Design a protein around this ligand. Sequence first.
Ligand SMILES: CCCCCCO[C@@H]1O[C@H](CO)[C@H](O)[C@H](N)[C@H]1O[C@@H]1O[C@@H](C)[C@@H](O)[C@@H](O)[C@@H]1O
Ligand code: HG
Ligand code: HG
Ligand code: HG
Ligand code: HG
Length: 266
Amino acid sequence: MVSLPRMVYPQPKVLTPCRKDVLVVTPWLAPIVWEGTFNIDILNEQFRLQNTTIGLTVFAIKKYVAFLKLFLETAEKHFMVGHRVHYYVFTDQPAAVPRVTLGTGRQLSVLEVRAYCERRFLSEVDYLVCVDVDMEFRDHVGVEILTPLFGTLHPGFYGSSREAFTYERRPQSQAYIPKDEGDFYYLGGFFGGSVQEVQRLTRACHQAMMVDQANGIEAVWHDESHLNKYLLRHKPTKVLSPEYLWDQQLLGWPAVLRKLRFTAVP
Ligand SMILES: CCCCCCO[C@@H]1O[C@H](CO)[C@H](O)[C@H](N)[C@H]1O[C@@H]1O[C@@H](C)[C@@H](O)[C@@H](O)[C@@H]1O
Ligand SMILES: [Hg+2]
Ligand SMILES: [Hg+2]
Ligand SMILES: [Hg+2]
Ligand SMILES: [Hg+2]
């Protein structure tokens, strides 16, 4: 909207690729976010000028409440630092949520679950980032991921052919994807976008799962299977590289990953 200020940074090189080892743009022209493809100073300027607010949602039920401390503490160190952040913790144990110290401009809302509006998101945040709680941030996760709709490449299938993807293969399921279809295998543990697009995705997933339930069938990987079906039919406007959701214990640290930003907790 408003003009960017004078900025001094390296001139982009038209005849020099960012990465020659990986795909950095999808066939529908959505960028694939890898370290080296973006200048965070330019992006931070663009989003701060918009006074962007990012909501981060996590569910912590039963034993999972034990992961909240590390999750929130590391998020404070690496997630959207410098921008407005609103954490939404959905739990069945409100009193068990740890007292984590937050930086300025950041807040946390604890929502007790077992039932209990989506309209609230529309008035409190601009973007929603939905992730798994048994994780920890180890490096920068910033505005470079913000876009109307984004999915993240599953760390165990990013180099696999579509036939090997663990999509739901039964035609009786609404999440069904044939062997000759599919772009990538997105993981259900890290997705997001504008509040509007995220609500459209979750609403579509909810309906598809209800239909499957009625027909007495459960997708092979549940929510993740439906997420993949949705993103196949509604292409994400940005795709995050596996840098954004990795498991170093199970997958190590490949050369193709310059940074490990968000990882599974052992
Ligand atoms: C990460 C290497 C990939 C192969 C390990 C099994 O990964 C599981 O894949 C299915 C889909 O095929 C689901 O996405 C599961 N949620 C995956 O396991 C979970 O995520 C991986 C990354 C590990 O953290 C594992 O411990 C989790 O259960
Ligand atoms: Hg580059
Ligand atoms: Hg969400
Ligand atoms: Hg769902
Ligand atoms: Hg979904």
